[PDB]
Amino acid sequence: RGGISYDQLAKLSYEKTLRNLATQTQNSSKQDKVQKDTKTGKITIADDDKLVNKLAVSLQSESKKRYEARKRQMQNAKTLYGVESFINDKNKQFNEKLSRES
RNA sequence: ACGAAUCUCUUUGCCUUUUGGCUUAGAUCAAGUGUAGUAUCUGUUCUUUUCAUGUAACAACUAAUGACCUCAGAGGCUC
């Protein structure tokens, strides 16, 4: 049991997004360079604007999905426990935090 | 009882609005009246300071506005 370290958590997050990129290519397949300017020193990479848009969309979708999966957790945990005496929400979140200690 | 994806749900992981010093626990757990000072309101006294009927005849007012012309705003004329 126990917790998962950050180097093991990062690999599992990297393994998970590779399966999201695998099925994204499978759902697409189901439906149907390097230039180095010598004067400036800058390196320009030419890439597809669709794959850059799909990168920007999927990060926003994962940002909203974790935002909504946490918002429902806020609305559920506020309306679970009311037995022990509280005063405000920061007291409830602290007295619940004492319960996970024991 | 192994779905390639979405939603809903359960359990672990994450705690994600999840107690921000000090010292003699920092110190104490007590009725009315009397006096002094400031402020407000009322009363009295003293002083100072703010003005000047009717009729007839004559004169002024209802300076400003509009327009035209000359000179480089003023001058003249009419309404």
Swiss-Prot record:
Residues 20-32 have a biased composition (Polar residues). It is found in: Nucleus. Belongs to the SYF2 family. Present with 1670 molecules/cell in log phase SD medium. Belongs to the NTC complex (or PRP19-associated complex), composed of at least CEF1, CLF1, ISY1, NTC20, SNT309, SYF1, SYF2, and PRP19. Involved in pre-mRNA splicing and cell cycle control. As a component of the NTC complex (or PRP19-associated complex), associates to the spliceosome to mediate conformational rearrangement or to stabilize the structure of the spliceosome after U4 snRNA dissociation, which leads to spliceosome maturation. The cell cycle arrest of SYF2 defective cells may be due to the inefficient splicing of TUB1. This is Pre-mRNA-splicing factor SYF2. It comes from Saccharomyces cerevisiae (strain ATCC 204508 / S288c). The lineage of its organism: Eukaryota, Fungi, Dikarya, Ascomycota, Saccharomycotina. The gene is SYF2. The chain holds residues 92 to 211 of 215 of the full protein.
